Paper text:
Thus, we have explored the relation between the effect of the pH and His rotamer-dependent phosphorylation from a functional and structural perspective solving the structure of several HK853–RR468 complexes at different pHs.
To confirm if the pH regulates the His260 side-chain conformation in HK853 and, consequently, the pH-gated model for this HK, we solved the crystal structure of the complex HK853–RR468 at pHs 5.5, 6.5, 7.0 and 7.5 (herein HK–RRpHs structures) in the presence of ADP and BeF3− as in HK853–RR4685.0. The overall structure of the complex at each pH was similar to the previous structure of HK853−RR4685.6 and HK853−RR4685.0 complexes, respectively and as expected, ADP and BeF3− were present at the active centers of HK853 and RR468, respectively. A close inspection of His260 in the HK–RRpHs structures showed the presence of the inactive gauche− rotamer, as observed in the low pH HK853−RR4685.0 structure, independently of the pH used for crystallization different from the trans rotamer observed in the HK853−RR4685.6 structure. To check the correlation between pH and the relative HK–RR disposition we superposed the HK–RRpHs with the phosphatase-non-competent HK853–RR4685.0 and the phosphatase-competent HK853–RR4685.6 structures. This comparison revealed that all the structures, independently of the pH, showed higher similarity with the phosphatase-competent HK853–RR4685.6 than with HK853–RR4685.0 (RMSD values ~0.7 vs. ~2.0 Å for the superposition of ~707 residues, respectively).
Author numbering:
A (entry chain D): 2 to 122
B (entry chain C): 2 to 121
C (entry chain B): 247 to 478
D (entry chain A): 246 to 478
Write the structure that this text describes.
Amino acid sequence: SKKVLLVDDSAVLRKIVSFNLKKEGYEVIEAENGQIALEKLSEFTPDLIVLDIMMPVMDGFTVLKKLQEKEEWKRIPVIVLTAKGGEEDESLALSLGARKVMRKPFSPSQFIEEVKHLLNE
Amino acid sequence: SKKVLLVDDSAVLRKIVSFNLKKEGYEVIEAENGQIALEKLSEFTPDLIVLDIMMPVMDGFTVLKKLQEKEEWKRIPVIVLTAKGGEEDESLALSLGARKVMRKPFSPSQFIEEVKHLLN
Amino acid sequence: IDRMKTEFIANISHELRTPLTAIKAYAETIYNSLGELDLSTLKEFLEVIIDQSNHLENLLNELLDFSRLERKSLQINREKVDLCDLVESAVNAIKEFASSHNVNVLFESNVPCPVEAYIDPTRIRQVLLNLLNNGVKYSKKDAPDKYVKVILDEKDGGVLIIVEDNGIGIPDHAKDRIFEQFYRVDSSLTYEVPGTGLGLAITKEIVELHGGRIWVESEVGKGSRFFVWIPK
Amino acid sequence: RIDRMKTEFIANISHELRTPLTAIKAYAETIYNSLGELDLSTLKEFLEVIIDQSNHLENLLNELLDFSRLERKSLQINREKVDLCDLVESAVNAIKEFASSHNVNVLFESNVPCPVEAYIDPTRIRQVLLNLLNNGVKYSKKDAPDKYVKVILDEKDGGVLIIVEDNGIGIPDHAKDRIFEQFYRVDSSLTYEVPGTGLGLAITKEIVELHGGRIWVESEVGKGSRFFVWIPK
Ligand SMILES: Nc1ncnc2c1ncn2[C@@H]1O[C@H](COP(=O)(O)OP(=O)(O)O)[C@@H](O)[C@H]1O
Ligand SMILES: Nc1ncnc2c1ncn2[C@@H]1O[C@H](COP(=O)(O)OP(=O)(O)O)[C@@H](O)[C@H]1O
Ligand SMILES: [Mg+2]
Ligand SMILES: [Mg+2]
């Protein structure tokens, strides 16, 4: 019953995040880039967004920024899950609106722990 | 039933090589370095030496050489399974005795094919 | 230069982290989901681990081949070889990487096959795959047609291989600079594409050990043609 | 930092990373080709190897990353008040495994009573302790009747004085300052099947000097080394 908007240009990453999310019960929806990601929000509104940074066409910091502009998108929490490991990259994403930032390589159980923590409150 | 001497200084490598070898019914005896492998050869003569190059105490090129200096060690095959990718490393080991040099990372299925070939 | 050294060190880490994330994710999932994984899913998540290690191994073999050529250990071993099979074989092996970015890979021969030559087939296969891989890696972001054609010919009592693409192309400020160790063009459209900058520095140097040369031609945003020439 | 040492370093990364890939590849092709022939607890072990050899790699890729950030000075440390006594302990646990595999015992005493407070980045000094501790295991002797690495903790000069003492190979005097240079490794005969990047101590000199601290070494060959870390209070 909990929709989660998975957003990463790597098809591999998608498979395995989508697998761990479907273990808990969640209902994944997948997007190759930021543009597409934003493009599928017309369709539905998710309880969670799992956002990459480095994608083609549209970037992940750009998705986060737009997430704060439109008022229906501000309240939905973003986890950022990125290979960008700089402390400087984390602060930009947090300041751009992301609720947590997880690095890659990641632990699927922690990511899940954290995905729960946002949804449960 | 066949008896393979396994001579690498990596617990990890040994264990997974021992596992694939024992899949075929072969029987493994292991060695931490080159020096120990030679000390173990007095307990038994093996059908096969899987030999690493880089190990502390006593090198794997050195073992290969010393297998040429003693009598019942000359005609027992060695496969060298090493991280040393150089084409010059392969030549040395062939001319210092080794019947075959296979590189690391390796395929367990190919390795096993080549072990069989040299036992049969 | 110490400048491009540092970026290179960062690029290696950047390019080795992608397969590793996979390995780590798939390996923990399998280990934490044996009861929740069916068989064709177990075998698949393993196949990813195996597949992403092979990407890793490639990238380590890139670093190693490079260092080898830097210290001039890499002597080639020449034999009579059909270059038509080589190239078919080579593109066959790039079909998966291609289809993942939706690039098609064609192959024509302006002379009739088979094309014999005195070359190291390990090493020219390596040249073909690096040029094909760059064809796939530097294709345009979205397009209906995206491609990489290899072309064979016989010019100047030697062999002439062209690897043609319709990808992003190269600014003239980097038609001389693409072959140097560590060099990459840093635009908006190469940001998230991985690579060390070594691939062509190796390919230039393998080709030059055969007594051959490689040159490039590129129209910025329309495509590129890479010309490898080896003697008979 | 010359072009020659860059080439030796590119090889060294290649060598460092090869080793766990071999495990990863060979453990993972086996599971795939042996689902019939692994019992459950050996399936779980072989995956535990894959997971653990990927951490080694990951560690290793963070050495490349940290160093690159320190080069371009992206890395700024974030100081906080920390207990150093249990920080030290926790790092010692994290090397327990690596240590035993080389039959290295790993100790800890404090000449000052615990717990010792300091304004440090805990992430970064944890990194500084592990590199010194690792090096302590990595550069142990071969013969193993009493090999160790001891972390001693004192308070000197309105500051904290961490010492990491080992009893291995020790370092030749014509190299005792060139161990902190990037890419520098000792090319001895009891030093080539020990992989490394030559970056671990460069990083640690840098983190300690982002803190306003310093590191030095006193090494008596065939006997051992002591590595002195100093940060203020
Ligand atoms: N087919 C191509 N089309 C456009 N640009 C290319 C092509 N091939 C190579 N390049 C450019 O040349 C650079 C160096 O290539 P290479 O040495 O293989 O390193 P990399 O690993 O970065 O691809 C690339 O970063 C890219 O900017
Ligand atoms: N505790 C130690 N005892 C003896 N030698 C050491 C010790 N720590 C470091 N070294 C020497 O310093 C060199 C560089 O160390 P470091 O910068 O950590 O890189 P690495 O350990 O990856 O080689 C090593 O190659 C080794 O020769
Ligand atoms: Mg990405
Ligand atoms: Mg070894």
